[PDB]
């Protein structure tokens, strides 16, 4: 009862910030562009130096003639609308935001400690107490999210960042949307597809509950449930309703994923009428302080190395790219609300 | 192995969202 009166008080503030969102609160002189984080389809993300403070934010930067390409405009417009107004402890939190001629600016927490991706390439495999640490965070914060009527869409270990403390930061909103019924659009990573997503189905949040199942199994085994050369070979494995799982798999973890990589959704964990209790009471869970996870006071499984401030060396290194900025306002009616 | 298998395929780098 006491979640529900958190997730009550949750909704208050985001209701009032979801309403009103913040608009226009930097520029991009009041930085210093460091380095490049990390890139996609949309767009790049810089380590940058606020002046005024000294503070080290991690800039994400999108092209609106490429945003516009892509079609992409409504979803980024979901994307700031909805972080601007997000108020969780695994959540990256957005700082500032702002846009200009060519492109849309999102400034965001800088999290020195690097993608969970790549840590676990590296090791191989999380440990099942290493990993169900990490999915204890997500599933509070999916719990958060939909109570929100926030589906997210794009679970991965690409957008979970490791902080200081060790614990996770989810980042990249761009499928993130606000929806009471079904839903129609065929977005995500392929690895974390629900079979409904790819059958061009109406889905709903129990998706964000189908790809955590695919993040457990991945970081416990080392490699998704379902992998392929082709995104349509992945797609033709998870419609066929089979899944194998690694000999080193615990009775209680193949438990848990056969009830969340669940094709049929009314025994699919999360989206029953028990919710999101399905999953916290599930024995694979049985060790796990949900208060003190929130809370943060779980000693975690790991702490990344810190070798200062607006240090990189827990991320990749990418191709820079300058940062161009038309005389000419490009898409403006598009992005108004931006 | 699966675990061969997986790190000989094509998709062990990040891995992009669908437009
Ligand atoms: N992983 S990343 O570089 O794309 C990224 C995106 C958004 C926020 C971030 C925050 N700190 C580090 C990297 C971040």
Same mark, same amino acid.
């Given at each position: 009862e006491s979640v529900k009166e958190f997730l009550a008080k949750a909704k208050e503030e985001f209701l009032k910030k979801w309403e009103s969102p913040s608009q226009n609160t930097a520029q991009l002189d009041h930085f210093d562009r460091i380095k490049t984080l990390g890139t996609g389809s949309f767009g790049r993300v810089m380590l940058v130096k606020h002046k005024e403070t000294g503070n080290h934010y991690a800039m994400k930067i999108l092209d609106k003639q490429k945003v516009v390409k892509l079609k992409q405009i409504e979803h980024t417009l979901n994307e700031?609308?909805?972080?601007? @107004?997000?108020?969780?402890?695994?959540?990256? #939190?957005? !700082?500032?935001?702002?846009?200009?001629? &060519?492109?849309?600016?999102?400034?965001? !927490?800088?999290?020195? $400690?690097? !993608?969970?991706? &790549? *840590?676990?390439?590296?090791i191989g495999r999380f440990s099942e107490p290493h990993a169900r640490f990490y999915a204890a965070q997500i599933v509070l914060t999916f719990e958060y999210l939909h109570s929100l009527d926030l589906i997210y869409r794009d679970l991965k270990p690409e957008n979970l960042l490791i902080d200081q403390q060790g614990y996770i930061?989810?980042?990249?909103?761009?499928? @993130?949307?606000?929806?009471? $019924? /079904?839903?129609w659009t065929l977005c995500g990573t392929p690895e974390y597809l629900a079979p409904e997503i790819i059958l061009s189905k109406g889905y709903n949040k129990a998706v964000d509950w189908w790809a955590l199942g695919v993040l457990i199994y991945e970081m416990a085994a080392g490699y998704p449930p379902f992998f392929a050369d082709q995104p349509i070979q992945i797609y033709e494995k998870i419609v066929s309703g089979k899944v194998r799982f690694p &000999? *080193?798999?615990?009775?209680?973890?193949?438990?848990?994923? /056969?009830?969340?990589?669940?094709?049929?959704?009314? #025994? /699919?964990?999360?989206?029953?009428?028990?919710?999101?209790?399905?999953?916290?009471? *599930?024995?694979?869970? @049985?060790?796990?302080?949900?208060i003190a996870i929130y809370q943060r006071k779980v000693e975690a499984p790991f702490i990344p190395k810190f070798k200062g401030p607006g240090d990189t060396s827990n991320f990749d290194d990418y191709e820079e790219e300058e940062i161009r900025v038309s005389i000419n306002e490009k898409c403006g009616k598009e992005f108004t609300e931006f | 192995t699966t675990y061969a298998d997986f790190i000989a395929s094509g998709r062990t780098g990040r891995r992009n969202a669908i437009h």
């Open positions: 700031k609308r909805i972080l601007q @107004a997000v108020n969780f402890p695994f959540l990256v #939190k957005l !700082e500032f935001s702002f846009k200009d001629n &060519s492109n849309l600016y999102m400034v965001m !927490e800088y999290v020195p $400690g690097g !993608e969970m991706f &790549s *840590h676990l390439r590296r930061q989810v980042t990249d909103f761009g499928f @993130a949307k606000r929806v009471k $019924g /079904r839903t &000999s *080193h798999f615990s009775s209680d973890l193949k438990d848990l994923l /056969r009830n969340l990589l669940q094709v049929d959704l009314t #025994k /699919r964990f999360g989206n029953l009428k028990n919710g999101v209790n399905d999953i916290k009471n *599930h024995k694979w869970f @049985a060790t796990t302080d949900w | -």
